[PDB]
Design a protein around this ligand. Sequence first.
Ligand code: S8D
Length: 152
Amino acid sequence: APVRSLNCTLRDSQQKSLVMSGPYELKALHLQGQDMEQQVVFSMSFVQGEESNDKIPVALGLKEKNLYLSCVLKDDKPTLQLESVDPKNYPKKKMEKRFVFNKIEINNKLEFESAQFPNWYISTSQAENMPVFLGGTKGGQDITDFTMQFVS
Ligand SMILES: CCNC(=O)CN1C[C@@H](C)OC[C@@H]1C
């Protein structure tokens, strides 16, 4: 069958929203009212991969864009990028591993671990207007916890 997808927004546990802030750039900032309506709308696809009760493999595409969050080595480090794909082939159930996040539910929050890079997480900074990034630590200054909002 097709791949199943849900539209959603994410907010970090400090309640910062995500917005595309330039060519293939995602930043996190405090938003409310008119400024929130520009927040990134993910198409979260439920993809092939190792699965458990609280650990669900997903891809995070941008709604109606041929753009996916992906995890790749850059200058020899696991990094988060926005990667373009052939819009005739995506989304698909068997997404390449760089596009796969383990969505992990712990204490009413979500973490997104890279499937490709174990123990590397979608992260935000405490400061406003900084990039969303792949972070290799938790319980530091970096935020690795999120909430999801379902969108029509
Ligand atoms: C051409 C639109 N570019 C944008 O940055 C604005 N949108 C991006 C989209 C993935 O999520 C909703 C948000 C309003």
